Amino acid sequence: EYTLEKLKDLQGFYQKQLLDDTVPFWFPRSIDREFGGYLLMRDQDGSLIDDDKAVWIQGRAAWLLSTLYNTVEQKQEWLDGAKSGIDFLNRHCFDTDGQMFFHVTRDGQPIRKRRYYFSETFAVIANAAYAKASGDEAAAKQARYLFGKCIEYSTNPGTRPAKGIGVPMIMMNTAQQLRETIGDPRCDEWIDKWINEIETYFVKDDIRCVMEQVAPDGSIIDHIDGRTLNPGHAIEGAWFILHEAKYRNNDPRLIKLGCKMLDYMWDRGWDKEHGGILYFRDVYNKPVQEYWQDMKFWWPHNEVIIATLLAYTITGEEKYAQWHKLVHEYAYQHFHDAANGEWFGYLHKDGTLAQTAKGNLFKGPFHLPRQEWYCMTLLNEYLQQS
Amino acid sequence: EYTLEKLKDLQGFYQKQLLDDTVPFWFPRSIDREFGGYLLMRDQDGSLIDDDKAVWIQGRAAWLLSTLYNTVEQKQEWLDGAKSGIDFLNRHCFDTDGQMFFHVTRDGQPIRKRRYYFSETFAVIANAAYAKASGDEAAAKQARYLFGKCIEYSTNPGTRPAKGIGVPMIMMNTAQQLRETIGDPRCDEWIDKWINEIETYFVKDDIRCVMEQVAPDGSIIDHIDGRTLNPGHAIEGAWFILHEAKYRNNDPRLIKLGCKMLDYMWDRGWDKEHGGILYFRDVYNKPVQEYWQDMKFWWPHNEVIIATLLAYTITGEEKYAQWHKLVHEYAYQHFHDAANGEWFGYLHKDGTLAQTAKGNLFKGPFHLPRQEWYCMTLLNEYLQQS
Ligand SMILES: [Cl-]
Ligand SMILES: [Cl-]
């Protein structure tokens, strides 16, 4: 399967895709010079379908620009672009009670506020990465403050109580990004707790499944919502854990855990008729009720590309190279827009395009550039060690 | 052409489908003998995929059974079934603040409560129809009490205010059902206000569109949510208005209003590539972001079948017979399950089945049986006058 020359070609592919295709689609043109932050809700040709701003994606974009500055090239325009988002978050995206908005207008007026703290987690990683890039001590302090607030909420996130895997997952990745940028003494211990929560409550070895939600004792909630799985989301967590495994000196327990989550959810998620990762499944193969259950979204593919390549480089198991080849070829052939750049977001089960937009309230410069950046970086490291 | 002969055939077809196929799929087996209410979340073969109870659908089902008893046949089984749903609503489906739940367990414990009051409107029409079928004065008083509360809610309620067409539409049909069962002196004057609201704010003659939401002054909100249209929903409102026109001795002004709404949204909503009514469209033909925008759902087809047949019997315009033939043939050929009865809910754009369930949190014994019952009784009245 994958030779070193082939992995060298893959490294260059992800690098050139990231820097010559994906990032230029968004930046610098998406930087809103008049109001700050980013205009990211763009059609296939780059034209705007909306001038609203999703607060999560403002933070994700600021994180990406800072991360490119810190790990790829110290381009002033990326630093300036990151600062524009940080400033927009601080100036407009916090309510008087200190909680962040979810959805604001171009000029920063609030449209939606969600009880969630997920906006805050993306402000943490954005401020952490920006603090590293710029030396801004205020951004460092904000990142560490909000991290604690996020921890606080995570301990305490209605006759059918359920806990969701997304809390430990997002907190783990937030803690990882905080560690890898400016550092914080809480990161490693809490990551341990969040991994233990994922393993204990959400990974079911007897049925080879990773749950999206469970009851507080870990039991499966046998109702429509509780049965609904998201393979791409579970495999996102799997590679967060494989990432942690490497940091922890290739810890065999964490390698085993990440790999089995990936194994379980590749089997449940990969569409053997049409190819690609199904968005939702049902733990007992009852019909999934969420309407988009069999659609092919971009971001599950981004996460499975990372996970399979990461699993392959860590374990050397050829099957992960075979799965990587499958999902990589599937995703780049079906989502990538060779004419205008970047990726479509939304395909039907059979791979035909459902609509042409490349950015909206949920899609922006995050999952795809993170995958291309992470894979380019991973392979550079891997090839240096070979 | 739609001859009297063809319309007689259709009349018998809808009657046979309603009584030999649609209703038997649900009743009596869906009657929850232990806890009351109805077990309606069923797979294609009738097996339960969940024992939860959607409060809207408990009221809709009680309304249907009462309506059948009143207008088709005084089956004791239907009356007893209607009372089961009424009692379940009264016993379990009101919160301590007087607002109704949206989603409860089999035994009536709350799962979810929504800010809307659509639960209440379906309790109105259920109690009204049951009050007529049984002479229960408590149900009649309840229907009128809840109706008054819905009126207050509708008149006595973010930097982007929007008003939705669903409120005046649902309130209109609620009032119509109240009028046609037990009567209420407020029905006609409030229907007039709601029709005026629909015509003034949501119907756009210049661009031939019916909006889902507009700004308080009626202007189009040129953002993703504000641009999103629902042709089936607009056409549901169209036939509510055509129904009112008939009630008002074929009021030509309401005929024109209902017909232009139908004309506008047939043109925007009918899928010329694959057939069927698309779920969402965009007023300016920008890409629609809601994931299921191009799926083919059962209930838009139910409503367009009513609207086209009603428009045809009222106006005699052959185009509405042509449109009815198209949507009738499309819907019964694609959604109807000849093997087990009733209709699948969810098809892809190209008409292929997305999943097999026939009842869930949103689909149950309502839109389809209402369409078959309404078309059967409409054609019976129409052919009695020829
Ligand atoms: Cl994204
Ligand atoms: Cl329904």
CATH number for A50: 1.50.10.20
- What are φ and ψ of residue B282, in 5° steps? -120, 135
CB contact under 8 A, A356 and B287: yes
Amino acid at A152: E
Closest by CA to B133, choosing from B65, B33, B85, B184, is: B65
Q: Residue A162: CB partners within 8 Å, gap ≥ 6?
A: A213, A214, A215, A216, A221, A225, A226
A117 to chain B, closest Cα gap in Å: 19
Q: Is residue B32 part of a domain?
A: no
User: In angstroms, what is the span from residue A362 Cα to ligand 1's centroid?
Assistant: 6
3-state secondary structure string across chain A: CCCHHHHHHHHHHHHHHHHHHHHHHHCCCCECCCCCCECCCECCCCCECCCCEEHHHHHHHHHHHHHHHHHCCCCHHHHHHHHHHHHHHHHHCECCCCCECCEECCCCCEEECCCCCHHHHHHHHHHHHHHHHHCCHHHHHHHHHHHHHHHHHHHCCCCCCCEECHHHHHHHHHHHHHHHHCCCCCHHHHHHHHHHHHHHHHEECCCCEECCEECCCCCCCCCHHHHEECHHHHHHHHHHHHHHHHHCCCCHHHHHHHHHHHHHHHHHHECCCCCCECCCEECCCCCCCCCCCCCEEHHHHHHHHHHHHHHHHHHCCHHHHHHHHHHHHHHHHHCECCCCCCECCEECCCCCECCCCCCCCCCCCCHHHHHHHHHHHHHHHHHHHC
Query: Within 10 Å of residue A80's Cβ, how many Cβ atoms?
Result: 14
Q: Is B35 contained in some domain?
A: no
B334 and B218 share one domain: yes
One domain for residues B312 and B280: yes
Decide if B291 and A293 are in contact by the 8 Å CB cutoff.
Answer: no
**Does A43 sit within 8 Å of B160, measured CB to CB?**
no
Angle at B126 between CA B121 and CA B130, to 5 degrees: 150
Per DSSP bridges, beta strands A228-229 and A163-164 are unpaired
Residue B314 to chain A, least CA–CA distance (Å): 36
Q: Are A232 and A184 in contact (CB under 8 A)?
A: no
Q: Are residues B58 and B175 in the same domain?
A: no
The C-alpha atoms of residue B234 and residue B277 are separated, in whole angstroms, by 12
Chain A residues contacting B via beta carbons under 8 Å: 41, 43, 49-50, 52, 105, 109-112, 158-160, 223-224, 286-289, 291-295, 346, 348-350, 354-357, 360-361
- Cβ(A105)–Cβ(A92) below 8 Å: no
User: Ligand 1 mean position to A302 CA, how many Å?
Assistant: 9
- The domain boundary, picked from A125, A157, A189, lies at A157
Q: Which of B221, B286, B294 to mutate to test the interface with A (most CBs of A within 10 A)?
A: B286
Q: Pick from B180, B184, B181, B113: which is nearest to B148 by CA?
A: B184
Give yes or no: residues A133 and A185 share one domain: no
- Indicate the resolution in Å: 1.7
Q: B300 and B205, same structural domain? A: yes
Q: Which residue from A50, A111, A294 is facing B354, i.e. has the nearest CB? A: A294
B58 lies in the same domain as B6: no
CA of B114 to the centre of ligand 2 (A): 19
User: What phi and psi values does residue A269 have, to the nearest 5 degrees?
Assistant: -95, -30
Q: Which residues of B touch A160 (CB under 8 A)?
A: 105, 111
Closest ligand by atom to B342 CA: 2
| Chain B environment of A110 (Cβ under 8 Å) | 158-159
Interface A–B counts its CB contacts (< 8 A) at: 84
> Nearest CA of chain B to the CA of A357: how many Å?
6
Residues of A within 8 A of B43 (CB-CB) are: 286-287
CB-based contact B263:B208 (threshold 8 Å): yes
Distance, CA of B362 to CA of B79 (rounded, Å): 24
CA angle A232, A236, A240 (to 5 degrees): 170
| N residues, chain B | 386
- What 3 state SS string does B279-341 have? CCEECCCCCCCCCCCCCEEHHHHHHHHHHHHHHHHHHCCHHHHHHHHHHHHHHHHHCECCCCC
Record: contact A348-B349, CB cut-off 8 A:
yes
- Whether the CB-CB separation of B10 and B312 falls below 8 Å is answered with no
Q: How many domains does chain B have?
A: 2
* Of A45, A43, A35, A41, the residue nearest A61 (C-alpha): A41
Residue B209 lies in a domain: yes
Residues A206 and A290 both lie in one domain: yes
In chain B, what residues touch A223 (CB-CB under 8 Å)? 50, 52
Domain match, B77 and B206 both: no
A371 CB-contact burial (10 Å; exposed 0-12 / middle 13-18 / buried 19+): buried
CB contact under 8 A, B287 and A50: no
DSSP reduced 3-state for B213: strand
Does B172 reside within a domain? yes
**Among A141, A157, A173, residue at a domain's last position:** A157
Is residue A121 domain-shared with residue A262, that is, in the same domain? no
Q: What is the DSSP string of B44-102?
A: TTS-BS---EEHHHHHHHHHHHHHHHHHT---HHHHHHHHHHHHHHHHHSB-TTSPBPS
What's the rounded Cα separation, in Å, for the pair B378 and B372? 10
Closest-CA distance of chain A to residue B104, Å: 9
Spatial distance between the Cα atoms of B308 and B318, rounded to a whole number of angstroms: 10
- CB contact under 8 Å between A291 and B346, yes or no, is yes
Edge-to-edge strands of the sheet including A53-54? A53-54, A103-104, A110-112
| Three-state SS at B163 | strand
Question: Contact A286/B158, CB-based, under 8 Å?
Answer: no
Which structural domain, as residue segments, surrounds residue A150?
A: 35-157
**Listed residue (A27, A92, A34) closest to A62, CA to CA:** A27
Residue A41: list chain B partners with CB under 8 A. 224
Contacts of A355 in chain B (CB under 8 A): 287-289, 293-294
CB-closest option in A111, A158, A357 to B160: A111
The closest alpha carbon to A64, from A101, A98, A30, belongs to A30
How far is the centre of ligand 2, averaged over its atoms, from the C-alpha of B297 (Å)?
10
Listed residues B157, B173, B204: the one ending a domain: B157
Ligand 1 centroid distance, CA of A22 (Å): 12
Method underlying the structure: X-ray
**Would the CB atoms of A355 and B293 count as touching at under 8 Å?**
yes
**Which tokens go with B361?**
């949190």
Alpha carbon distances (Å) from B248 to A137, B69, B188, B244: 72, 26, 10, 6
Cross-strand partners of A336:
A343
B316 in Cβ contact with B322 (< 8 Å):
no
Question: In chain B, which residues touch A (CB < 8 A)?
Answer: 41, 43, 49-50, 52, 105, 109-111, 158-160, 223-224, 286-289, 291-295, 346, 348-350, 354-357, 360-361
B363 and B277 inside one domain: yes
Instruction: State the virtual CA torsion across A194, A66, A22, B225 in degrees, nearest 10.
Output: 70
Do residue B291 and residue A346 have CB atoms under 8 angstroms apart? yes
Residues A305 and A349 in one domain: yes
CATH number, domain containing residue A293: 1.50.10.10
Rg over alpha carbons for chain B, rounded to the nearest Å, is: 20
The answer to whether residues B347 and B295 touch, using CB atoms and an 8 Å cutoff, is: yes
Among chain B residues, CA nearest to A295: B291
Q: Is residue B214 classed as helix, strand or coil in its secondary structure?
A: strand
Residue B34 lies in a domain: no
A138 and A190 share one domain: no
> Tokens in use for A33?
């010079």
Interchain proximity B294–A361, CB inside 8 Å: no
